[PDB]
Design an enzyme around this catalytic site. Structure first.
Site, PDB file in Angstrom:
ATOM      1  N   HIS A  22      33.183  11.767  -6.204  1.00  0.00           N
ATOM      2  CA  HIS A  22      33.510  10.765  -5.195  1.00  0.00           C
ATOM      3  C   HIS A  22      33.663  11.300  -3.784  1.00  0.00           C
ATOM      4  CE1 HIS A  22      34.651   7.717  -8.561  1.00  0.00           C
ATOM      5  NE2 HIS A  22      33.366   8.019  -8.520  1.00  0.00           N
ATOM      6  N   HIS A  42      25.809   9.585 -14.909  1.00  0.00           N
ATOM      7  CA  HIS A  42      25.702   8.577 -15.956  1.00  0.00           C
ATOM      8  C   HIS A  42      24.800   9.034 -17.091  1.00  0.00           C
ATOM      9  CE1 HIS A  42      27.413   4.664 -14.064  1.00  0.00           C
ATOM     10  NE2 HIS A  42      28.147   5.722 -13.771  1.00  0.00           N
TER      11      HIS A  42
HETATM   12  C1  HEM Z   1      37.144   7.747 -14.145  1.00  0.00           C
HETATM   13  C2  HEM Z   1      35.614   7.939 -14.033  1.00  0.00           C
HETATM   14  C3  HEM Z   1      34.753   7.288 -12.980  1.00  0.00           C
HETATM   15  C4  HEM Z   1      34.703   5.964 -12.683  1.00  0.00           C
HETATM   16  C5  HEM Z   1      35.442   4.759 -13.204  1.00  0.00           C
HETATM   17  C6  HEM Z   1      33.636   5.888 -11.712  1.00  0.00           C
HETATM   18  C7  HEM Z   1      33.265   4.803 -10.927  1.00  0.00           C
HETATM   19  C8  HEM Z   1      32.278   4.473 -10.023  1.00  0.00           C
HETATM   20  C9  HEM Z   1      31.860   3.176  -9.511  1.00  0.00           C
HETATM   21  C10 HEM Z   1      32.389   1.831  -9.931  1.00  0.00           C
HETATM   22  C11 HEM Z   1      30.865   3.538  -8.662  1.00  0.00           C
HETATM   23  C12 HEM Z   1      30.052   2.563  -7.823  1.00  0.00           C
HETATM   24  C13 HEM Z   1      28.660   2.107  -8.310  1.00  0.00           C
HETATM   25  C14 HEM Z   1      28.203   1.304  -7.238  1.00  0.00           C
HETATM   26  O1  HEM Z   1      28.710   0.153  -6.930  1.00  0.00           O
HETATM   27  O2  HEM Z   1      27.248   1.688  -6.536  1.00  0.00           O
HETATM   28  C15 HEM Z   1      30.620   4.953  -8.596  1.00  0.00           C
HETATM   29  C16 HEM Z   1      29.756   5.707  -7.803  1.00  0.00           C
HETATM   30  C17 HEM Z   1      29.640   7.096  -7.700  1.00  0.00           C
HETATM   31  N1  HEM Z   1      30.170   7.955  -8.611  1.00  0.00           N
HETATM   32 FE1  HEM Z   1      31.743   7.562  -9.871  1.00  0.00          FE
HETATM   33  N2  HEM Z   1      33.030   7.087 -11.398  1.00  0.00           N
HETATM   34  C18 HEM Z   1      33.737   7.963 -12.199  1.00  0.00           C
HETATM   35  C19 HEM Z   1      33.299   9.275 -12.257  1.00  0.00           C
HETATM   36  C20 HEM Z   1      32.346  10.032 -11.648  1.00  0.00           C
HETATM   37  C21 HEM Z   1      31.959  11.418 -11.797  1.00  0.00           C
HETATM   38  C22 HEM Z   1      32.503  12.275 -12.920  1.00  0.00           C
HETATM   39  C23 HEM Z   1      30.992  11.638 -10.894  1.00  0.00           C
HETATM   40  C24 HEM Z   1      30.247  12.952 -10.670  1.00  0.00           C
HETATM   41  C25 HEM Z   1      30.574  14.459 -10.715  1.00  0.00           C
HETATM   42  C26 HEM Z   1      30.714  10.450 -10.140  1.00  0.00           C
HETATM   43  C27 HEM Z   1      29.906  10.334  -9.026  1.00  0.00           C
HETATM   44  C28 HEM Z   1      29.695   9.201  -8.254  1.00  0.00           C
HETATM   45  C29 HEM Z   1      28.842   9.120  -7.085  1.00  0.00           C
HETATM   46  C30 HEM Z   1      28.301  10.291  -6.321  1.00  0.00           C
HETATM   47  C31 HEM Z   1      28.806   7.814  -6.738  1.00  0.00           C
HETATM   48  C32 HEM Z   1      28.225   7.207  -5.483  1.00  0.00           C
HETATM   49  C33 HEM Z   1      26.792   6.555  -5.701  1.00  0.00           C
HETATM   50  C34 HEM Z   1      26.173   6.079  -4.514  1.00  0.00           C
HETATM   51  O3  HEM Z   1      26.558   6.386  -3.353  1.00  0.00           O
HETATM   52  O4  HEM Z   1      25.169   5.314  -4.665  1.00  0.00           O
HETATM   53  N3  HEM Z   1      31.554   9.488 -10.623  1.00  0.00           N
HETATM   54  N4  HEM Z   1      31.539   5.494  -9.473  1.00  0.00           N
HETATM   55  C1  DDJ Z   2      28.408   0.394 -12.393  1.00  0.00           C
HETATM   56  O1  DDJ Z   2      29.430  -0.205 -11.594  1.00  0.00           O
HETATM   57  C2  DDJ Z   2      30.102  -1.145 -12.313  1.00  0.00           C
HETATM   58  C3  DDJ Z   2      29.644  -2.458 -12.334  1.00  0.00           C
HETATM   59  C4  DDJ Z   2      30.371  -3.442 -12.996  1.00  0.00           C
HETATM   60  C5  DDJ Z   2      29.945  -4.764 -12.955  1.00  0.00           C
HETATM   61  C6  DDJ Z   2      28.593  -5.058 -12.826  1.00  0.00           C
HETATM   62  C7  DDJ Z   2      28.165  -6.381 -12.807  1.00  0.00           C
HETATM   63  C8  DDJ Z   2      29.091  -7.412 -12.915  1.00  0.00           C
HETATM   64  N1  DDJ Z   2      28.682  -8.678 -12.902  1.00  0.00           N
HETATM   65  C9  DDJ Z   2      30.445  -7.121 -13.041  1.00  0.00           C
HETATM   66  O2  DDJ Z   2      31.354  -8.130 -13.115  1.00  0.00           O
HETATM   67  C10 DDJ Z   2      31.564  -8.492 -14.482  1.00  0.00           C
HETATM   68  C11 DDJ Z   2      30.871  -5.797 -13.064  1.00  0.00           C
HETATM   69  C12 DDJ Z   2      31.556  -3.107 -13.644  1.00  0.00           C
HETATM   70  C13 DDJ Z   2      32.011  -1.793 -13.630  1.00  0.00           C
HETATM   71  C14 DDJ Z   2      31.284  -0.811 -12.964  1.00  0.00           C
HETATM   72  N2  DDJ Z   2      31.720   0.445 -12.952  1.00  0.00           N
HETATM   73  C1  CYN Z   3      29.768   6.670 -11.568  1.00  0.00           C
HETATM   74  N1  CYN Z   3      28.910   7.244 -11.326  1.00  0.00           N
END
Ligand code: HEM
Ligand code: DDJ
Ligand code: CYN
Ligand code: HEM
Ligand code: DDJ
Ligand code: CYN
Lengths: 705, 706
Positions: free
Chosen positions: B242, B79
């Site tokens: 991921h 990020h």
């Molecule tokens: C199409 C692009 C991407 C989308 C939409 C996306 C989406 C997300 C979301 C929604 C989460 C969950 C946050 C949470 O609830 O804790 C997450 C976590 C994660 N993302 Fe992605 N991500 C993308 C790309 C990437 C890239 C490029 C990397 C790194 C090379 C990355 C690495 C990770 C890691 C390692 C976690 C896990 C965090 C944890 O275990 O606390 N992401 N991502």
């Molecule tokens: C960082 O992970 C995310 C979080 C939310 C998110 C956070 C808080 C609220 N409330 C939500 O609903 C509106 C969406 C939406 C997209 C991504 N990726």
């Molecule tokens: C998404 N980190």
């Protein structure tokens, strides 16, 4: 579109932008040259001669009324100085900020863009030798003089600003020409100098747009009082000013005037209100608008007036008698006449009992009217310039006015290096603690405000009314400290045999410096604070006690003092006051953090004193503030306290206020705190604290400006 | 309760606050000392050792998932670097601005406040020797390495910022998590790196909140392209990232999470989202072993069929049909219980989109290809805004230089001395090249520099290569004439030497510009000597990724009074934006434009803004004439960008100009500056201020000398 600001997403976010204005001098000027020196090279008489010529040199793009621009320039000067507020010393003519938004676009300043434009050739001719700030006031002066009235004096020395003053809170309204600051006339919310957003003092048609003279008088009195003027000064200023010129309202400004400068097309090149219409009110006050005389007072008092709707659709007053009918020549048509008019705010001076008595006396004594107006005009245009030392030029009166918070001369020789070290040793050897010394020195210097250059340690006014009795200064404790310092002063003076003496003013600062050096020494650092002797002790005779109440702090970060009255969050007031001391965010952070290690709190509380070794200058405040092993929460049954509990044991570790905690909450302040709280940043913090301490102690020493 | 802003009263008012950020460096740190020197004193291995320990050191206020904080730190690093936009080079990890609003409070950065907080002890321990910016990326690297994957390299050198970047336009929306930037997926409004306000790239649930993977792929492709990444890099980064961790959504974040950091109570001390962790609102791991590098993500994605559903947090997520994956992953905080894996709509996008699918199949067939692509892409992602190779510091910088670093060749020859310098300067002045041609060319060369990502500048003489040599603003035909002449001078000089000395075209271009400025000052009666630093080299096509330089193409150029017809923003807004990239303050910009107009270096040699009767003579005529009330201005009829300055009495046209010229006489602050320069005794000052600014711009990309 444009990038949305954090201020929009989070309205409550600290406005640290105001402190950033102190981090450097915006503008193309060499950050080292001083204006005073350049003004000294100016041939004032030459500029005045050029201004005199300009008075009758009409330009086609803005034809001079009655063939004389004088009245227009007086209005310009009055509005420039007219935004001054005693509450914080901000506003006023000292920086010429009428040239920048939002002031340059206030409805009250309509067409002053043309007035300032008429002066551009003169400004260009003299360049850096005369500031816009100085030039605008000088134009007002020459205008008055050219129309038959000698001014009391004039002083140059106002350095031009290059942007607006971001620290000024002009009001809560979301629209110009509207008011949400008073329910009843005479009861405007604290801090504001006007009764309406976008106006200098009050609404010319009357409160809330109603032609009620009695009610108007209440707002006139309160607003002028907040601008440091009493009844006699206020009546003198309004009557003297309206003795000249006219109001413009050929038609409704709402539908006949283009956008204000800030909203105008780029081709307008800084001008606005493209159409003569200015306020929407129409007509002259006197029969001879370009001559000093008793015309205004006579027209106002010798005739009965009635409220009516003018050609511009605004409330104004006309005389019943037909004697004044078409008694004034038209401002531009040589074969047309015009009838005198009065504003609701003018009738207010006749209806109000107290103002009426002043006006009647003025009418019976033209000389007294003149004397009072000349002195009030001088005060109005110079009250934010500071002490006499800052008044420059050949037209500065020999007489010093009380509002200049004058300082006496020193009738003795100044102490040297040997004497200085001697006095520092004796002060530290006394029964006064490091904390007492630091607190007292801060109490003395912290009253300074760069807005109007009032306050500071010079003069030792801390020992006089009203400061000696301010709650924040802890009167009881203060007398004890001053008592000991006075005894040292006496012993020192009596032991001299060469004419040397030391002032209490200098001892207070020297004591503070000594205590800081000692606190640093306790921490293992050898620091020497540069000291400049020369401060003197001012007396009650030359101190307007009531006027110093405006300098009383509501929140003091160094002493962790918070008045129970405050409406704004404490940290907001902290930043506001920090700006008055010309502090940057980093300087404020170093100052507060270092101070907490020394411990100089009001009532000697332990608030924010995150250290086990008080009076030892270290970075313990930051180290302990940033330790995640501690969790913070609001104290129960407390309005300003918070408790720092051991996240694990749950045992109370520290106590603090929002002043302390904001440095670990605000994103930018936290980044600064992290630098000072690092393992190898203690020496840096000590040095930065010392630099800021020294800075504040010398703020009112213009002997080197 | 608080002071109002002119921004609120007048929305169209120029945001000069962005240039003010260039006047002073907020923060408690001085300037005499550079961060590079401090980083050099750092024991990198020692920091990495501490980071390795941190990975398995759980704090009760934010307990580590799977007993390892690695995945959380990878997310923090992604990020941090993920806000980068190639369009202006802003955003990114180089300043660690994830620490400040608005970024620190974006919904996509929920709980990263805790991730950054876990690193505070290490930050305090090493102090100035390692910036937050450098530390956040290093934490991601150590996390990846600790979980079984070797990184391609690491460079330090990112100096910490002390406030947000006020020049970044994050989008038109008035609310986080909403979008008013695309009507069709893959058609996002230009200048934006994300498809939604407050998100890094795209909505994890799908475009406009619909679980449509095919459509999601279009937004993923466009946003990653705007962040300098192609299909293979994008697929590798998402799949590689991921392969680790999980998404957190124990319940709905809308009603279970407290205010974001900027809106949270003072006692939370910078933390926010005070609540079974809830972050995105989506819940579950992608793989069976979330803390180990393997093929778990690609295998789960491609070897099983997935179906969309609403998760426990009320968000869209995908679940596997096969019961083989049911309860196949240990619970994040309880190894004794199990959980079923999940996929995001954006992950399914990689399987449903034809082009991404092909890449993923290749990755699954050869783990080595997947690994290398991820390693290279991760390095690029986290270092693309650090500038050229000379700015990459430390023992872990790879020996191999990548094309995205815009590398420069070594000077395999001796540099010319003062004698040769003077010699070459005279030769240029004795040529048939005019003062205007020389200044225009030197400006075209140096003006591509942007302080945001440190790309561009006169070093390398890329002006002579694609794509710059063909940009409309550079007047290709005219440019070739000047370069042809200077190249002949270079050849003549190099062939006449015998002591191994040579001069580069890059240096000649700047030297010629300096000589022309000196000449223009001389024509005005001023004797000025511009300091010259030889050493610039000539880069070749092999050192240049041409398409990537398209991003540096100007839409508006103040010095040359060039305005593209297809601009949405007012020209002066773009002018200010571009001025910020050159680290200019309002006063420096004013001196530059005003001084330039007296020289006359306009695109197509027009007279726009050239308010002087003596072109090529450096004076303050621009200001004197702009401020003369004897002239009235008006828009030129049937013209989109032109204005006429008419004699107020006769109505005769005196001058022609654009908004670039007129803003200096309209904006309240700029006008105050113009008045200083337009005063009777300010010409010498203007000349010197112009020269100082000119020299500053010419040397912006000289880091080896910086
Ligand atoms: C199409 C692009 C991407 C989308 C939409 C996306 C989406 C997300 C979301 C929604 C989460 C969950 C946050 C949470 O609830 O804790 C997450 C976590 C994660 N993302 Fe992605 N991500 C993308 C790309 C990437 C890239 C490029 C990397 C790194 C090379 C990355 C690495 C990770 C890691 C390692 C976690 C896990 C965090 C944890 O275990 O606390 N992401 N991502
Ligand atoms: C960082 O992970 C995310 C979080 C939310 C998110 C956070 C808080 C609220 N409330 C939500 O609903 C509106 C969406 C939406 C997209 C991504 N990726
Ligand atoms: C998404 N980190
Ligand atoms: C209760 C306070 C006051 C109010 C409400 C007020 C109001 C006004 C208004 C409505 C106008 C007309 C603007 C226009 O249409 O052109 C005007 C003009 C004028 N005012 Fe006042 N004023 C006050 C105080 C003062 C003071 C303190 C001075 C100076 C010592 C001053 C001097 C003048 C002069 C000379 C003009 C005429 C300008 C011209 O001829 O163009 N006023 N005033
Ligand atoms: C609301 O009607 C107006 C009023 C004024 C106005 C009123 C009082 C003072 N003093 C003034 O400055 C001279 C301007 C200016 C413009 C409009 N339209
Ligand atoms: C004007 N008053």
């Amino acid at each position: 579109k444009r990038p949305k600001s954090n201020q929009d997403w989070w309205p409550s976010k600290l406005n640290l932008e105001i402190l950033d204005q102190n981090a450097r001098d915006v503008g193309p000027v060499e950050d080292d040259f001083d204006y005073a020196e350049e003004f000294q090279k100016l041939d004032l008489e030459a500029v005045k001669s050029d201004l005199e010529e300009l008075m009758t040199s009409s330009q086609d793009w803005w034809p001079a009324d009655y063939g004389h621009y004088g009245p227009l320039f007086i209005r310009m000067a009055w509005h420039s100085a007219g935004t001054y507020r005693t509450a914080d010393g901000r506003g006023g003519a000292a920086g010429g900020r009428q040239r920048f938004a939002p002031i340059n676009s206030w409805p009250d300043n309509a067409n002053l863009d043309k007035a300032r434009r008429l002066l551009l050739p003169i400004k260009q001719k003299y360049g850096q030798k005369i500031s816009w700030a100085d030039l605008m006031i000088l134009a007002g002066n020459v205008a008055i003089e050219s129309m038959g009235f000698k001014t009391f004096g004039y002083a140059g020395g106002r350095e031009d600003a290059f942007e607006e003053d971001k620290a000024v809170n002009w009001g809560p309204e979301d629209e110009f020409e509207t008011q949400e600051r008073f329910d009843e006339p005479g009861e405007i919310q604290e801090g504001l100098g006007a009764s309406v957003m976008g106006l200098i003092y009050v609404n010319p048609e009357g409160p809330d747009g109603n032609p009620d003279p009695e009610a108007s008088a209440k707002n006139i009195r309160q607003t002028f009082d907040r601008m440091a003027m009493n009844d006699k000064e206020t009546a003198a200023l309004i009557a003297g000013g309206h003795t000249f010129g006219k109001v413009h309202g050929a038609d409704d400004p709402e539908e006949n005037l283009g956008p204000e400068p800030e909203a105008a097309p780029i081709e307008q090149q800084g001008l606005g209100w493209q159409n003569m219409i200015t306020s929407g009110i129409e007509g002259p006050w006197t029969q001879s608008p370009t001559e000093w005389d008793m015309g205004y007072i006579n027209n106002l008092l010798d005739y009965e007036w009635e409220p009516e709707k003018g050609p511009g659709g605004a409330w104004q007053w006309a005389p019943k008698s037909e004697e004044l009918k078409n008694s004034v020549p038209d401002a531009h048509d040589p074969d047309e006449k015009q009838t005198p008019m009065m504003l609701t705010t003018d009738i207010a001076l006749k209806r109000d009992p107290d103002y009426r008595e002043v006006m009647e006396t003025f009418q019976e004594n033209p000389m007294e009217f003149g004397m009072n107006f000349a002195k009030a005009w001088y005060k109005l245009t110079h009250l934010d310039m500071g002490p006499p030392e800052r008044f420059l030029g050949p037209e500065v009166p020999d007489e010093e006015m009380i509002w200049q918070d004058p300082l006496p001369d020193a009738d003795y020789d100044l102490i040297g290096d040997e004497e200085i070290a001697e006095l520092k040793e004796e002060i530290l050897d006394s029964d006064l603690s490091v904390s007492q010394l630091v607190k007292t020195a801060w109490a003395s210097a912290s009253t300074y405000r760069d807005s109007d250059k009032r306050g500071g340690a010079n003069g030792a006014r801390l020992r006089l009314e009203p400061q000696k009795n301010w709650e924040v200064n802890e009167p009881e404790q203060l007398e004890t400290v001053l008592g000991t310092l006075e005894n040292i002063q006496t012993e020192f003076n009596d032991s001299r045999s060469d004419g040397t003496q030391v002032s209490l003013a200098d001892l207070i600062v020297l004591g503070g410096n000594a205590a800081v050096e000692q606190a640093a020494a306790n921490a293992g650092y050898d620091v020497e604070i540069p000291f400049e002797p020369g401060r003197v002790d001012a007396g009650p005779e030359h101190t307007d006690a009531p006027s110093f109440d405006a300098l009383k702090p509501k929140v003091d970060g160094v002493r962790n003092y918070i008045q129970d009255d405050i409406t704004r969050p404490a940290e907001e007031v902290l930043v506001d006051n920090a700006d008055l001391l010309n502090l940057t965010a980093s300087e404020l952070t170093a100052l507060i953090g270092g101070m907490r290690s020394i411990g100089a709190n009001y009532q000697d509380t332990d608030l924010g004193v995150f250290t086990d070794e008080p009076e030892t200058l270290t970075n313990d405040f930051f180290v302990n503030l940033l330790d995640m092993g501690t969790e913070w929460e609001p104290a129960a049954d407390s309005e300003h306290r918070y408790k720092g509990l051991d996240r694990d044991t749950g045992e109370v570790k520290w106590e603090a206020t929002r002043i302390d905690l904001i440095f670990g909450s605000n994103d930018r302040l936290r980044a600064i705190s992290e630098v000072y709280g690092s393992a190898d940043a203690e020496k840096k913090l000590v040095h930065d604290f010392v630099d800021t301490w020294s800075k504040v102690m010398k703020l009112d020493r213009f002997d080197l400006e």
